[PDB]
DNA sequence: GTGATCAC
DNA sequence: GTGATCAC
């Protein structure tokens, strides 16, 4: 579960600050990989993935 | 190619 | 079972 809300852009374009309903980071060993949140476009209700800044608390 | 996640 | 999310 996220707190902190995200500017992310959505799917349908638009630019939105929104709070992951989970996050997580994905990475291979040896490599620093990438933060991940789960979203949902408030506007279509459809849910999207997006980068998470690197110090965003998992 | 590899890592985690889950809506679909 | 996978799309799609990114960095290395």
Same mark, same amino acid.
């Given at each position: 579960?996220?707190? @902190? $809300?995200?500017?992310?852009?959505?799917?349908?374009?638009? #630019?939105?600050?929104?709070?992951? #309903?989970?996050?997580?980071?994905?990475?291979?060993? =040896?490599?620093?990989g990438? @933060?991940? =949140?789960?979203? @949902?476009? $408030? #506007?279509?209700?459809?849910?999207?993935?997006? @980068?998470?800044?690197?110090?965003?608390?998992?």
């Amino acid at each position: 579960s996220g707190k @902190k $809300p995200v500017k992310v852009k959505t799917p349908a374009g638009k #630019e939105a600050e929104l709070v992951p #309903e989970k996050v997580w980071a994905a990475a291979p060993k =040896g490599r620093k990989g990438v @933060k991940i =949140g789960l979203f @949902k476009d $408030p #506007e279509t209700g459809k849910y999207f993935r997006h @980068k998470l800044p690197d110090d965003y608390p998992i």
